[PDB]
């Protein structure tokens, strides 16, 4: 019983009165979940492969430098604002693990 319908149309919560029920989650909706088998593989490959030229320019400019420029530049390469924001956040993690470890 998520929400109770009012019973009259043309309102904030319009609808027809009924007894809604909760249902078991379908397996098709588990697409984006992380798996421990794929995190192990993706971590090892990053060590072997290394970084890319456009990442190397942002990561240097991201530390001891501007942060707006690091996000203007990322958008121009990746092409969209949403992906640029996520990529910049992930690279901030790699700098944190490197220097703060030892």
């Amino acid at each position: 019983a998520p929400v109770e319908r009012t019973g009259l149309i043309r309102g904030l919560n319009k609808g027809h009165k009924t007894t809604r029920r909760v249902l078991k989650e379908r397996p098709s909706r588990r697409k984006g979940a992380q798996s421990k088998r794929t995190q192990f593989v993706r971590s090892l490959i990053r060590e072997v492969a290394g970084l890319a030229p456009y990442e190397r320019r942002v990561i240097e400019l991201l530390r001891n430098g501007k942060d707006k420029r690091a996000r203007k530049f990322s958008k121009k390469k990746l092409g969209t604002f949403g992906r640029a924001k996520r990529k910049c956040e992930e690279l901030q993690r790699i700098i944190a693990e490197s220097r703060r470890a030892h």
């Binding site: 593989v41 072997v48 290394g50 970084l51 890319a52």
Partner: protein, 202 residues
């Protein structure tokens, strides 16, 4: 197993390890013929994903194309028409370079059937592909029911009829409100909308 790591490694095509390995191979190519046999696939994970198997009757060929854009072939520049369609230089072909590569291989091997193809390498004036072929007359093929569907006489030369994976992309073969005019065949629907039907009792 190991095939999982190859999937992840091939995603990073800008790393120093991968970029070096593509440069050396492209020089190894371009010294052989335009079309030539390949002993074994160079991308074992990618070929396996598309139906390739390591048993008799499966062969691999590779080919390159010119990587440009279509220029309208006319004597000099004259077109003899209205100004709206007298351009010659910036026109474009309506099928992908991947499709042309598959088609030339089919004429070379006229007794086999084309399954799929994939991108291998590219250059300033060339793009390289590898094509998977299947022998429809081998006994080891007709025995297995997972593939013997291809031996039927209805799958003859499906390269130039637009039935492979790249052929379905070049046509609007998808569901939804976006692919309206070409969902079931562009020319078929144009016939349906332009027919005048008369019944006995009007």
């Amino acid at each position: 197993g190991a095939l999982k790591y190859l999937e992840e490694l091939s995603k990073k095509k800008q790393s120093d390890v991968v970029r070096f390995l593509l440069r050396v191979r492209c020089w190894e190519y371009r010294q052989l013929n335009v079309i030539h046999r390949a002993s074994r696939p160079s991308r074992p994970d990618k070929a396996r994903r598309l139906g390739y198997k390591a048993k008799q009757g499966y062969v691999i060929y590779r080919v390159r194309v010119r990587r440009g854009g279509r220029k309208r072939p006319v004597p000099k520049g004259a077109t003899y028409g209205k100004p709206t369609n007298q351009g010659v230089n910036q026109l474009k072909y309506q099928r992908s370079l991947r499709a042309t590569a598959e088609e030339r291989v089919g004429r070379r091997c006229s007794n086999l059937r084309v399954l799929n193809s994939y991108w291998v390498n590219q250059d300033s004036t060339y793009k390289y592909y590898e094509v998977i072929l299947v022998d429809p007359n081998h006994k080891a093929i007709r025995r297995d029911p997972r593939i013997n569907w291809i031996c039927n006489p209805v799958h003859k030369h499906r390269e130039c009829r637009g039935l492979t994976s790249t052929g379905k992309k070049s046509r609007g073969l998808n569901k939804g409100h976006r692919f309206n005019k070409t969902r079931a065949g562009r020319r078929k629907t144009w016939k349906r909308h332009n027919t005048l039907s008369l019944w006995r009792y009007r």
